[PDB]
Design a protein around this nucleic acid. Sequence first.
DNA 1: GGACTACGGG
DNA 2: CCCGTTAGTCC
Length: 205
Amino acid sequence: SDYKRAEKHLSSIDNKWSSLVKKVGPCTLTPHPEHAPYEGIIRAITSQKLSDAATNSIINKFCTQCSDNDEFPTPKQIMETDVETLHECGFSKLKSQEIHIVAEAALNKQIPSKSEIEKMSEEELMESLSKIKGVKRWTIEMYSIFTLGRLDIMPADDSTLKNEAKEFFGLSSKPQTEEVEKLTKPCKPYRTIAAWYLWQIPKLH
DNA sequence: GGACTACGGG
DNA sequence: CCCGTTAGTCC
């Protein structure tokens, strides 16, 4: 598998990478490529500046409030929900508005199809999805990693990743995005897995 | 009880 | 890199 290859590739870089992979164990990153783009994008938007626990509670309230079935709400279902009802699920007002925008775009077929997104390079995904209000570099990276299942995404702009890179690379302060990109270059073409390993560091304590 | 913990807005 | 937001956890 690519995970097995990624684990061996990372371990091959140097002793610290080898040790990190051994401490954390096999990669268990589980993306959900079965999700429609509007769903993956809404999930990523919700996660901005929020813990996974908070994001989870919000999406769960969202499903119960807007779905006929407690499944992920459809674009039509989202459109039929007023902003304040969305807001009481725990989205910020601004995210609530952006989620309506995503739904309307999906409903109007203004989002690229799932089929075309699955053919796009990271660069094309960035160009295509960043037009959506509330969706910029980080959100697209998270969509690419946790929905699409892309293997070579380095979300070097992610604050948590920078903090773990600080620890792993033995830095005395928080690295800039561009510094993280340089430091993780040898991890190509499995930078998503590299990022996942760094992200597991707090669980080692 | 809290401190603070990507993105658009003004 | 002016300013404020959503929630839950664990400092």
